[PDB]
Amino acid sequence: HHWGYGKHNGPEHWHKDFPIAKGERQSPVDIDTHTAKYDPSLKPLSVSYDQATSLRILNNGHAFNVEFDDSQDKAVLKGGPLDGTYRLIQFHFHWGSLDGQGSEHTVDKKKYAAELHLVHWNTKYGDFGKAVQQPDGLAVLGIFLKVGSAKPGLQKVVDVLDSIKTKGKSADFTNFDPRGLLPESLDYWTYPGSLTTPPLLECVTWIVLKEPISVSSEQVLKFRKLNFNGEGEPEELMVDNWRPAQPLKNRQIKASFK
Ligand SMILES: Cc1cc(C)c(S(N)(=O)=O)c(C)c1
Ligand SMILES: OCCN1CCNCC1
């Protein structure tokens, strides 16, 4: 009876196994754009993905992960609200059963169709497993997806999904460039938070881009053909794998703009 999103093991149950679910810096949150404080001291975000080395794609039974070789200083996030250098380890998405829901963060209560998370760990802690034990261990770049025109740079991901339909499937996934998933603007909001799935560790500096990317209806329909179940189990479509907004608890969300 492991955690998931389904009828009896979803977000409102997670606190029983992971009491930090009711902690002081949980994610995601609603971003109240009017109460976000412009911080002129924030720097432009530096996203250096030129040398990124994707390796594999994995259906982990919750989402799919596109995984990167993080054994050298390649694909790094720095600047913005960050001290130091954070290395890309994986990205994944959260999405809905319908275009009207799917994102984890909300903007003035608006839900997007989906949300991309590019997960990075602080190089001062040596790898990912040690970084998640620290309050400044991770930096996650969050990008909203709306349904409209296709995102050409997403199509290589969409096309491999049928090879990883079910939980625990993987496929070689080399030479994928995550720069093709980024919007024009790197304007962002930022706040201290957590993983959004168990173990819900309070180790993340969240950086949420204001400008969404557009994906097509056909691209997101393909995400909704994935399965939460393993091969040879009854089909449970992988949809609505998002945690709802959690209490802000007096944390301040800062804006890089306006
Ligand atoms: C391992 C892992 C899993 C997940 C779902 C996340 S998240 N959703 O971006 O907070 C992170 C940071 C790290
Ligand atoms: O054309 C791609 C459709 N696939 C089929 C099964 N897994 C999800 C996406």
Ligand SMILES: [Zn+2]
């Ligand atoms: Zn996520």
